[PDB]
Amino acid sequence: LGVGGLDKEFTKIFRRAFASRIFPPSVIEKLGISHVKGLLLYGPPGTGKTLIARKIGTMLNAKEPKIVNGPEILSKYVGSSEENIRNLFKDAEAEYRAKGEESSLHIIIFDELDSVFKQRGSRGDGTGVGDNVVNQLLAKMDGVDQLNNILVIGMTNRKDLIDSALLRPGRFEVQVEIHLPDEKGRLQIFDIQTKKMRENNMMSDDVNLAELAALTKNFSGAEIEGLVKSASSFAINKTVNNTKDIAKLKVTREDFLNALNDVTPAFGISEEDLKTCVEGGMMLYSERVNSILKNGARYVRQVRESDKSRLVSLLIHGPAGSGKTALAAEIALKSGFPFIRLISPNELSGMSESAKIAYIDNTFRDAYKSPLNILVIDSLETLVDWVPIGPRFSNNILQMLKVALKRKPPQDRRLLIMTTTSAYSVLQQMDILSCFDNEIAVPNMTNLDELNNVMIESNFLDDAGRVKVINELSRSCPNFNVGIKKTLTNIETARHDEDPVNELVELMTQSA
Amino acid sequence: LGVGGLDKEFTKIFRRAFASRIFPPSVIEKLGISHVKGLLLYGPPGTGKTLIARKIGTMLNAKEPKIVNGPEILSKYVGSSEENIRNLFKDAEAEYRAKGEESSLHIIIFDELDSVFKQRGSRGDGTGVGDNVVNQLLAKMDGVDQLNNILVIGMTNRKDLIDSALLRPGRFEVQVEIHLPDEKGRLQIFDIQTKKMRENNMMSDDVNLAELAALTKNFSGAEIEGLVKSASSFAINKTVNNTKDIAKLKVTREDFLNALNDVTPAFGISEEDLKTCVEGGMMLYSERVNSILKNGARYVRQVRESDKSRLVSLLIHGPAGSGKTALAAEIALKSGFPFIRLISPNELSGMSESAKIAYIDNTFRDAYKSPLNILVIDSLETLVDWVPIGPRFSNNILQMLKVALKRKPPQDRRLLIMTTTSAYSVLQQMDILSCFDNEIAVPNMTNLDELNNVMIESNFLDDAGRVKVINELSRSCPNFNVGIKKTLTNIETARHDEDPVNELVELMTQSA
Ligand SMILES: Nc1ncnc2c1ncn2[C@@H]1O[C@H](COP(=O)(O)OP(=O)(O)OP(=O)(O)O)[C@@H](O)[C@H]1O
Ligand SMILES: Nc1ncnc2c1ncn2[C@@H]1O[C@H](COP(=O)(O)OP(=O)(O)OP(=O)(O)O)[C@@H](O)[C@H]1O
Ligand SMILES: Nc1ncnc2c1ncn2[C@@H]1O[C@H](COP(=O)(O)OP(=O)(O)O)[C@@H](O)[C@H]1O
Ligand SMILES: Nc1ncnc2c1ncn2[C@@H]1O[C@H](COP(=O)(O)OP(=O)(O)O)[C@@H](O)[C@H]1O
């Protein structure tokens, strides 16, 4: 005991990796079988793998597990690395000659395994550093030097990089996956972490753990440890400057609520980028805008409450300066989904091409590990480096994006994608219009009534003047055609001049 | 005894490689012949090669075979690699001086042979690691230092890489192939594996091995051994938590049936990818769909009960959104074949060009080792990276695929191939249309009756409302042209709205 939220996995591991070790050697001999010598656990970081490995050892009363780290061995000098691997198994070798089939169990943990394979074959074999450890390790548990006391546990974050040679029977025969916890699991983790405080009357009676289990929506276990530590920090600092009356120390609900603002999770919301940069006003100057927002809300609920629709892709298009991005963000912030991210040119500035591919792929990879997700892609045509003189563009990134937009996430998960563009004709010429499930159009302003609404909404000036602007434009140029960004960047400059009324009309004539 | 399914090969090996060692030396000298010093076995892994190697030795009462692993020798430092070969034969050299012609037989096993040749000539010769072992090895069995007590066995999974110089007489004269077992072979392997349970009264009376032999369709030996071990795991875990009344332990049929869900074989069915990703509905909305499914069933039965047709290939083509892939998958799952795989852009994402070529070639190789096989190739034009601005595309992959679609499998095996494409004219220009034997076209929806059927079958809403949609469309736009995918996306997006009828009408008019 000491682990929460992983009952089913625990039963599965114990049935296969350890159950046969409990029985006396006689019956195992009489059945005619041989023990399992490899187990592979995979999943995201900070989720509780090493803890399971450690706690299973305590029931069997084996020795304390030895631990080894991948880059440690790989980074040492060649000769030392070659000599190192033989030093790990010495104790297990000795006890076998001592006691044979009655020997006690020895458990070895191997961490960041994939790092050994993550290199080109030429460098791995010519240098030999990558291949040497793998070969010696397989020799010690499969070949003629077979040693019958050991059990090896390997831990990885990316299963697809492990070579298939290692997965066949006789080597790493059992594989298990660990998931981010759900609400009930987090309730248990909170209990395990606050037990010691609760049992010494150092925790206040206003704390309700069921509510915290609902606020911490997409957290892992390590994050919960951090949250408790920060809460305790509040209570400790309130008394220092070391004083009398330490015996009345107690943590309180306010401490936790303030703690939430200091620990931010991975797999969370990129709040600042969406809120500040992309949204500096929202005003309902026409019926079309309200229509667009209602359609967006439709799609959000559609994704949230159906099992047929687990991938929806949309394209928002229109002229430059119309409003696209701000709309996308506005749809995202009202959703309430736990996971939201955006890919934009700002993030990829200053990189080489290969780096760009790696970044995009890791982002999509991370989107596949939570129950609900949203992704925003900004200005597709710029990510591909389009210039029309050549024309010139990067084909590899285009193919990466083309494949990513159609793939479906695994195991009853679901995501939504929004993308924004200003060069619809180019996308038509590159024939990737078959990826998007629906299209939305954003038009400019073309009636003077809309202008009046915008002026009313931004507190331009009293009615008497706003009438004059419309009257002058009525026969200056009644057929104008301008976006919203420009209109709201001409009102700003007009306000700080000496003749507001005569300045805005001229700027509007010029833009049209 | 201890091996099953390989009687013919046992006879043929014993007749050539060993029969001469039994006779007294007088008669062998008296005929004037010489013993054979090389034997090569090739076949897929986990099929029983080292087993036969060990078992043949115990009849002759030779010394326990020494074993050496290729990459082990190649990965060591250069000096020790050159020195170590000479240590392998030391004992054999000793006994020859000791006793002369009357010595006993010495048997040396060499594993993963092809690895030594799998390198460029420049690196192999300049470094010398690859060439040195080969040269020193041939010296000991062919040259003036010929040693007359040894026998060398080579073991490899790919014969095409071994150089033709080694196979000539005096070196590795005899070559043999190992196959995956057929039904009777599996029936024998089960007996060999379950003997010790049966002889100690630890196996129930309901287990019938003839049924298990028929369920496990493309298993090799190692998978059958793992299957027995997993069933034992079930029987053991049911008591723990180590108790009284261990003596009544017994395995049972339920355990085997449950064990089938835990061991998944190579050369099996990739169920999840075909089932989940590709099929999220199937509804018979017209006569053309019935016709297509019936044609597919026809071809399957053709491939299964004829000797003249050992290779068939089909092309399914039509507009984007028509239904293609889901059809292919539907035809595949109903077939009941043992082996099914598919190649799609998802598996090849993020690879270099050389890696892609290697992956495709390995897949086609793995297809040629079972009686019946199905392959599905999805979105051909995306595999080649087509973009029409240049145009730009990869020529090497195209030539690889063009060769692969005509090659016929060896030795009375047979396969069926299906491929899907949306760019028929592009392939017309590439001139690869001569590879396919038949062509199927999938059309779009063009009648209101079909739409009625689709609405009825998806439970859209009660009849009273269902009639009104058809009424309104009958005079809004009677000549519409839309695929199935977009229809089933508009339906769902109209169920979660406040006025389903108007919303559906507007969307469907826009798509048409
Ligand atoms: N109703 C509205 N719709 C859209 N944007 C609005 C609205 N009201 C105010 N705005 C503001 O107007 C600005 C619109 O500029 P935005 O960056 O979204 O343009 P864009 O279409 O993405 O153009 P670009 O081609 O330059 O990327 C934002 O600051 C947004 O907050
Ligand atoms: N009778 C049917 N025929 C084909 N597809 C059907 C049928 N009934 C339902 N569907 C559904 O139609 C959906 C769309 O089909 P599918 O994904 O195979 O299209 P596609 O031709 O591969 O398109 P793309 O151009 O995107 O590659 C599938 O999810 C399938 O489940
Ligand atoms: N399921 C869990 N229950 C309780 N504590 C957990 C859990 N998962 C992680 N932890 C906390 O995480 C810390 C160690 O996690 P760690 O060993 O880093 O996992 P990983 O295998 O991801 O490295 C411990 O201090 C432990 O309290
Ligand atoms: N044809 C067979 N008959 C009996 N046992 C087999 C057979 N094939 C494989 N096995 C099982 O496989 C194990 C050894 O296979 P292995 O020596 O790894 O063959 P190879 O490595 O040459 O493919 C043994 O435990 C044996 O019980």
Numbering used by the authors:
A (entry chain G), B (entry chain A): 239 to 479, 488 to 758
Paper text:
SNARE (soluble N-ethylmaleimide-sensitive factor (NSF) attachment protein receptor) proteins drive membrane fusion at different cell compartments as their core domains zipper into a parallel four-helix bundle. After fusion, these bundles are disassembled by the AAA+ (ATPase associated with diverse cellular activities) protein Sec18/NSF and its adaptor Sec17/α-SNAP to make them available for subsequent rounds of membrane fusion. The disassembly requires multiple ATP hydrolysis events in the presence of Mg2+; as few as six ATP hydrolysis events are sufficient. The side-loading and side-release mechanism explains how Sec18/NSF can disassemble SNAREs with constrained topologies.
Next, we asked whether this same side opening of Sec18 occurs in the hydrolyzing condition without SNARE substrate. We prepared purified wild-type Sec18 in the presence of ATP and Mg2+ in a three-stage procedure that yielded a pure sample used for cryo-EM studies. Two bands were visible in native gels, indicating two oligomeric states. Processing and classification led to three classes, two of which appeared to be heptameric and identical (280,935 particles and 73,253 particles, respectively) and a third class that contained indeterminate density in the D1 ring (70,513 particles). Density for the N domains was not well resolved in any of the classes, presumably because of the conformational flexibility of the N domains without substrate or adaptor present. The heptameric class is nearly identical to class 4 observed in the y20S complex under hydrolyzing conditions. Each protomer in the heptamer is similar to the others, with an average r.m.s.d. < 1 Å between them and the angle between the D1 and D2 rings varying only within a small range of 61.9°–67.1°, in contrast to the hexamer, with a range of 60.8°–92.3°. The D1 pore diameter is 30 Å, larger than that of substrate-bound hexamer, with a diameter of ~11 Å. The substrate-free structures (hexamer and heptamer) are nearly identical (r.m.s.d. = 0.48 Å) to the substrate-released structures.
